[PDB]
Design a binder for this molecule. Sequence first.
Ligand SMILES: CC(C)C[C@H]1NC(=O)N(CC(=O)Nc2ccc(C(F)(F)F)cc2)C1=O
Lengths: 215, 215
Amino acid sequence: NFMLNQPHSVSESPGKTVTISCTRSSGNIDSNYVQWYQQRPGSAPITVIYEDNQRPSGVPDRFAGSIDRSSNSASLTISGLKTEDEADYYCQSYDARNVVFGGGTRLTVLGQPKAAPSVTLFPPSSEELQANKATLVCLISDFYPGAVTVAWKADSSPVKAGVETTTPSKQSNNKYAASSYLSLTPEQWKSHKSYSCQVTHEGSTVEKTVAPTEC
Amino acid sequence: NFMLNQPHSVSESPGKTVTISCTRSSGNIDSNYVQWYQQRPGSAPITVIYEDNQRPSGVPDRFAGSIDRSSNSASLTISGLKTEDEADYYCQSYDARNVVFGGGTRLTVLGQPKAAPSVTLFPPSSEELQANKATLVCLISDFYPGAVTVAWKADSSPVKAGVETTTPSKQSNNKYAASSYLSLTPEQWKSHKSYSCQVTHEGSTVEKTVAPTEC
Ligand SMILES: CC(C)C[C@H]1NC(=O)N(CC(=O)Nc2ccc(C(F)(F)F)cc2)C1=O
């Protein structure tokens, strides 16, 4: 099957225009129809676009679907942004019986200034090593909007297994914090030169690295 | 045009069978295919049923779709109910003029067992101390239910400033995780013999202690 690649997040202030892209990994974007679903936090999904650019009745003309054959993408363009437009947006298409959804885009209608995350990566604590645990923690604090993507490297290879990332929560400064932790065994930790935690926010990626040391 | 009516919520104990109905307001349930989506907190939805009763790869066979033409409904039936099945469920169908979703059913799995937190306390990294910061993190994981309280100590004394604890979130093991972080200056960290993180959950307290290094 093909994938549909959406940006993890977008933001803009009220009244502005935002575009959300949906890139088809293989085949022709024009070969099958693209739908867009809005899911407001705590709500059921709603279709805002079907068949690339058709609006269901009740969906404001502020929402526009398009297809860019040159880039093999679909886009949802929302003009005149309102606070009610804050939601996850999903694109969806198919090859044959295989329905393919995008990973979803969080749209934030800015309610406060943007803030870039503080990122701190901690190597295993002495105590946990004695319980046969080498959990690493990546603390991510003081950010806005509340949407982040976290990726871990063992040396330069993506890690998949043993990653958990908490749902960002607003702290006492009204900015978001979260932690990602990678539950390594001491064997895994020592068996690599270094581990890295990459945090993506508002399309800038920061990275921190830790390594077994002599102390 | 039509709507799909689902129960707002259903509850059941492990091992039992739960049924979630989806009633089509207008036109025949059998005129168009029904899909079912599962969605866990802070995650994107997944397909559990398509074309009324087909299970995707990797969906447990405990999930069964059906159609009842006489009550003009579709049902998702979950057998041998597991804690991991706690989620929102959405039915979805079509009418050429739109893709239509149900309002969603929140399924609660009753009688989940109390689970004590794993607590790991990380002293400041050499790298953050070099950048003039001395944040500690207390990683709290695998606890149920999803409520903790955290107190910090500098030596034996209560820490009254610089503490933040994230809102617990449910992780892939269906238990909660949170981090408490204390934002010390390097001078504060080095001025004490130790700092401690005390995690209380269901009346039981776990305490961890870290001290400045010697290298
Ligand atoms: C084999 C396929 C039919 C199912 C498989 N393919 C795929 O794209 N997913 C992810 C998925 O269903 N995502 C999804 C994302 C959003 C929604 C929506 F629109 F909010 F209801 C519904 C579904 C799957 O679980």
